[PDB]
Amino acid sequence: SDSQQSIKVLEELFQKLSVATADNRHEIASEVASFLNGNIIEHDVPEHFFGELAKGIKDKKTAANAMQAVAHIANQSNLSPSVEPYIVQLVPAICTNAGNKDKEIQSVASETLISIVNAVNPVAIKALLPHLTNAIVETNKWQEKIAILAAFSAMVDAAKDQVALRMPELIPVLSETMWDTKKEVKAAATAAMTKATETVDNKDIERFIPSLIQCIADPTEVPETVHLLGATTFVAEVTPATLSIMVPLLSRGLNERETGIKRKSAVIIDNMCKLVEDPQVIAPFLGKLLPGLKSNFATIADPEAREVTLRALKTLRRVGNVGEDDAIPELSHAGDVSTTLQVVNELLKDETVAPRFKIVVEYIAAIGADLIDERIIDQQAWFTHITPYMTIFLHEKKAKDILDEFRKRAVDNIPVGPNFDDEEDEGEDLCNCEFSLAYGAKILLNKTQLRLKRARRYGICGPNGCGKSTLMRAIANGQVDGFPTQEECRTVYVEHDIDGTHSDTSVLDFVFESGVGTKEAIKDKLIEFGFTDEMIAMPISALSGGWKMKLALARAVLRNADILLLDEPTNHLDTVNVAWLVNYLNTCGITSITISHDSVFLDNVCEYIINYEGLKLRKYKGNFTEFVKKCPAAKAYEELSNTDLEFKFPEPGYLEGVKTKQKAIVKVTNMEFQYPGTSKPQITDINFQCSLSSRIAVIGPNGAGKSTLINVLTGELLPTSGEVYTHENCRIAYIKQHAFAHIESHLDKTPSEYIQWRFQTGEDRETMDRANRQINENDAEAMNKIFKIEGTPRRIAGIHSRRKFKNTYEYECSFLLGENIGMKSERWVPMMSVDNAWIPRGELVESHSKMVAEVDMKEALASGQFRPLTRKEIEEHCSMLGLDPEIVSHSRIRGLSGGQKVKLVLAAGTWQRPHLIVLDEPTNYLDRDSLGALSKALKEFEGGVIIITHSAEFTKNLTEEVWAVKDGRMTP
Amino acid sequence: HHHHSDSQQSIKVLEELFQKLSVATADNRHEIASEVASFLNGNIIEHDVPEHFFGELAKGIKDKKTAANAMQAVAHIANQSNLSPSVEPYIVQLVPAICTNAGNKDKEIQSVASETLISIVNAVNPVAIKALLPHLTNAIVETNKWQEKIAILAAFSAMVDAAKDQVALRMPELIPVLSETMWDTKKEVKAAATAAMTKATETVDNKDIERFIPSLIQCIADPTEVPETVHLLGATTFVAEVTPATLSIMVPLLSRGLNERETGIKRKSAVIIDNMCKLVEDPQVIAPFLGKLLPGLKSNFATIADPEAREVTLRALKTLRRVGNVGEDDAIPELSHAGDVSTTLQVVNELLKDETVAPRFKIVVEYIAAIGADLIDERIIDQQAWFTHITPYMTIFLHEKKAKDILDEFRKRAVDNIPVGPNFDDEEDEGEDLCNCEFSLAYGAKILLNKTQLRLKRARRYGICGPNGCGKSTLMRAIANGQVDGFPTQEECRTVYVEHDIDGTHSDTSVLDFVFESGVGTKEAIKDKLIEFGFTDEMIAMPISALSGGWKMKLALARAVLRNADILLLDEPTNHLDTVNVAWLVNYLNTCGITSITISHDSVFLDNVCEYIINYEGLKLRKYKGNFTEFVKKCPAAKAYEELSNTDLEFKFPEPGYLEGVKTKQKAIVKVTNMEFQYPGTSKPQITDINFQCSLSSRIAVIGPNGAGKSTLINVLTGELLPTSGEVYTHENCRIAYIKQHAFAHIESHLDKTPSEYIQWRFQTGEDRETMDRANRQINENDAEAMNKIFKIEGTPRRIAGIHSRRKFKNTYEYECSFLLGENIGMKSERWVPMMSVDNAWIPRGELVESHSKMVAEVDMKEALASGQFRPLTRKEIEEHCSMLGLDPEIVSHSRIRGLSGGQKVKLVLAAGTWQRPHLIVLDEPTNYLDRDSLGALSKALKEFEGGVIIITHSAEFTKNLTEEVWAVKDGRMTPSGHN
């Protein structure tokens, strides 16, 4: 009913929109946008509305209006998941409009495509990309190609990790476009190409990227570029993105004319492909290299070029895991949309999914498929991204039971990759053993192998109690079958030496007694290690944790060690000393084997990881983080990374005048909201109060009145009438699932930089200005927006102060008055203080976000409410939410679990220590596990709480007050 | 003069070596080229040049029969680590002829020429670019042979890597040349030109336009893409300062954009021009480009009807006039010619007017003029910097004293031509103004500042700088107490002089009550902030007398927040703060969102915090955009702020590493007996019957005029030349450091690196690349099919499969190699079969380095680790080592070498050279490139060096009371004299 009311409101607004002019177009699009993205319909979609919107887009007369509405609907912080799939479905029609002969329609279309690319869940890339690639390949309108190429570029910044995996399919498309006959298209294709390459993220070839781009544009530079690439010694993994940029150059290298080049190409091919850890990766590229190699291993005289070629060929076959007769293995279809769709259709066979929800099912499949390519398999991650789409037509419990099953089956398709290859790696082995290990009749390792390379740094991992320390002890004592003797390979178990030196003994005589050389030779090295004469002569009993470690490593050098064995080396060590230890290990030139619960340490030191898997040792090239990507079961160990527990929200900020948690800090009276254009208000005669003790639950089915009440409460919509009292400095944290899904656009940052990103302007960009298109950042000219004040045209000269205006802010603005408008003597003259005026935040942010921010910054400081974004403060804050300091300041979000991302997002949401936390349907995307932790945190929250939900089970023992909207009204 | 015997012997040796050279075949070519190179680059001639030799070389390069041989000699002579300034200008003088050969029909001659140009580019003093570049630009523009163009283009590319800073300043001249070349009909030339262009853009020192570089280059190739390309850059937010490199790439595009038909393109062009150019800080930077922007903008303003496009066009025109300092009637400001070679050339010729400079030295004067012109362009003005670069060329035809006296006058006169340069502008930057004052400052009747101005922006960070004692602290105190005329009252602009507050709190008062007694809010409110800040409940309740230095600083800032401070004032805030607390302060100041003014002797702290530098100049305050490092670029005099006392110039060399079996400083660690060296092809050995010893107490002076014998003796002593006969004993682990002027000048190729990175670069392979293998080309990095070098051992052709160990051999090293035996060499069945250990053989280092450097470095590395002599390149040790040589730790790991003064660069190079803690230091003519101040410090450091010292000098003055042992070569013989 209140839901059926929504359908009507959408009709009135759409009726006004179709009539809209270039003058009022943005005003109504905004209304449609703010209303459509809220909780307005109960388990269904405004089918008729989307139908009219679709139709309107295809008609000249309304193309601009309909599309401009989409751009507003598809803003960066408020696109509702209940709407998202229906917006993406319009991209095709919109691409066509990007090729229209009419300038206005063509421009709005181009604009709308960028808006959509920046608004969708980045993980849903597989539902959007095909529309853009299909379009640019099949169109003959050059302006359309340029608009789609621009949308490709915007996507690189919006979903970098997701795009990276699509590179092998995207690069050839951009390459082909670079050869378009239209010069403008050539120019645009080259630019998008340069943009797309930002996803390679490979230090080894980075500096040659512009040289590869040029080659795509002109083959004649291939020899020149091959000659230019020969020396690149690869270190970092060779990803799909690396190949889509390398192979085409090489392929043309092989089929070159001169023997030298053919040879060079092979070297590069060889050198690069051996670094391909997964066969599925090189699979789609094999066909562009193998033939060129076979043709060469049988057409070039010189026995040098041949040997090279063969080596490459052999590498390709090994790495490619090719089969007999040069047959490329059958690619896995775990990440194919076609596959995940079959799984979801199958799981929905006994559910009657109406026609209008089919598009959603496809979206779900698309998201599921992408999560598989990104190897995101934990339960919370899936609930975070797909559940919200499913409740569009299914009930939460059914959706969740079905979802959990969908992920289990989708995950099982993930192919089991092979193991490292003991043969190839570089260098004289320090040891190469086949052995078993038993500790007190207990088998720790059976018929396993251990090969260590000189100057290489290794880390040993495994489930707690698997025998990590015992193996190390074994290596230290030479109790591994086949291990070299101490004379052949000197091992030093750092800090684990036992002796009988008196606590009186001097540091000098302590080392001397070890029979490691003369006292002169000892002082020499100790000094070189940072020791002073005073320390060398002092009693060992006085050395600190840092100096004992340094002392031990100094002894290692004098002992001429070949392998340094360390066990929890960062224990009792402060940050400067850990940093010192990291630097020393990376530069001492000696092999080291480490066991540490500090993943950050392991990442900074290890080049390889030796993991316990059953009673076998399995090698993995890379640090701990790389290790985890290749071995999921590692995320369940006892490393600093895997540590996850429950959380607590911060204490709200101090408020003067509030002595009792029952005093109202927010009180609204006779409040009413009515969209301009609607027949009657969505909510009226509203009255309510909030306090630090509030425990309110906004219950009921989605509808016009319930959502609008929410939108006025959270600051999105400005009440059309009524009084709003807000205690100075009162802050509200609005928690939506949008932030939880969209954090996937920031996997490249540390939790800390993410929090800095969200509060860049001083306010939460995720929730502030949800009613505005905030895509305006490159608007040098959009700053010339004209404001109409007292009947005169004006431009903003400055913004000086701020003050509360109901449920938002107003800003004092100084102006420039427009004179002789339209004439050759037009000018904008600065006005006097007297003519300054207060202008609502909503009318300023789109064109002057920077000035608004500078002003918000001042007011925050002037009122003592500003919290600095220091690493220390962020770490402290994140600790309360269950995140570890080292991981927050040094680890990339990419390595966090769904649950950890939940903590990070809650931390980011509560960073300003709000007095009122408003949660928007938290059970819609959080599993029982996360719901539990959140429940406790909300019970203990020292500030007010307002939970919007349908789940009564979640509200019991948590809330006590109830808000329910009936016929545009309600009573607390 | 007086005829110099050993010196005349050198002329004779070169003649014999040239005779052998002109006869060499592609087989033995490299062997004698190497001989000519190692000899020519030594101290062989006393104040003159082997004139006839250079004439023969030039005549040989122009002759088909001998072009290959002669150019290959030039190639070996121009190696990356041993090209002598005595020869350098005569080598560059041969470039035009070498270019012509790069376009020769003959396959061999053309190839050798191409290779030689690269060698020369990589061998010259980067600072002498203006002497080499013109040869290359002129050659590529007048030649019609396409292979010659490809070779020169390759040379420009190598230039970018060998002298990046110097090339960046040359971009406005280079880019147009590369662009024309891209329009060459020949398809291989267009590709090569485009590649060179792509390489040149690397001189753009920022990322503002990275994603558009390939588009801009493509645009130059196809100007019809200008309109669309202009549409693409519209979205560029220029942040970094606009330099000559950025302008050279942007202006041609914008200039065409302005002349385009569509009003939309004329408008977009203006917008980009406006945004980019208001980031120009020196009008001389944009002056040569104004003529390509002003007329178009003027024409567009008169032609366009649309008011928006008109306003945009007019706005860009006003920015151009402001930033370009354009005068009346839109006159482009007079171009300073301070950096023109013709300007510095006129200066030196005038200073040399009473000196008779022979025709054969004309090329050197011109070379000296080029170098000076570049020092000025790079704003390198200190005395030591000029002595490092120029003195060595001057002593080719002048005595050291006369050279140094003229050189110092040359520098002063040249530097004096550097233009004034208007102050810097804050207005268009981002901030509301906290203040804007016109004032004077007097302290006890002493004038600190006279009629100057001070404008501070809200939320902006400033650093105050100026010579010691100029008044920085008084100004700050003045600001805090509102004693600067027109400064806002406390109510309008609250300032907090961090940690300089005075009150009467008991040492008993708790932290909470301390803050509370200041009347800054209730106790509840205060507790809320302190906790938010990081204070625990325990600390909030404890006595203030209990806080550490770090928490007092943190408390002080917290109190500033409770007082709602608009401006924070900090005076030497890093004092009494460990690195963790200093890092915390930096972070806080950068994120507190409040304006801050800092005074600090730690330029590194200023670089991490400041956005602007307010500098005391005379009795005026001058503002500069950027942090300290950027400040020093616009104000080079600022590199002498911690100079005032003679003590900051001193340094000490490290203690040589421990050696077993050496219990006295007289114990010989190096002993040579019956030693002789004779170049193959000469009529008689250069030195013979040589005997000598070196110990940790050696204090030797290798005296005498330059010559064949003296130079060869040194070349054997330092390891470059393997003795032809005689015995050499070297104590195990004995290390020698050879300090040559070459390293001091060539560091200008690493201005981008921090001192720490520079040192890591020099010892990347565990050995010093500046002095090791000076007799080898060693420029083989992309040596992949040259590792397929065939070694003839025991009459059988072999390839190296691996190198396994090292052992001492005379004055160098031998390496145990395993081989691949060649079978059916030539046939289709040819193969390289690995041999057994029994066939391994010891091969001298000199024969392996050019083709197997990586493998050799891996062996040297293992021997260093096994002998326990290895020194890890950790930040801590590198800092500890550089501090001994008088360099600050913070500067060594965080500051770019570009910001160091000439005297500081000297400490750094000395630091690099003695990094491995040698037992002997051999200095090659130190007085030739060091000024009085550096010499004094060096003399003291040598006197205290706990290892041996060997000084190759002509100065009896510098050795008096330093050395007592004497080595003087006479007729190929030398017997040590003096005492120890």
Ligand SMILES: Nc1ncnc2c1ncn2[C@@H]1O[C@H](COP(=O)(O)OP(=O)(O)O)[C@@H](O)[C@H]1O
């Ligand atoms: N149109 C919609 N699109 C997406 N989710 C919706 C929609 N309508 C309701 N939901 C979600 O339905 C969830 C509750 O489902 P459930 O309790 O099973 O059904 P009901 O609320 O009718 O008892 C809530 O989390 C709510 O967010």
Ligand SMILES: Nc1ncnc2c1ncn2[C@@H]1O[C@H](COP(=O)(O)OP(=O)(O)O)[C@@H](O)[C@H]1O
């Ligand atoms: N041919 C040369 N080229 C460059 N420098 C030279 C040459 N010959 C000598 N010098 C330099 O001359 C410098 C000063 O010598 P000086 O003392 O003036 O003359 P002399 O040593 O003959 O008494 C020495 O540092 C020496 O390195």
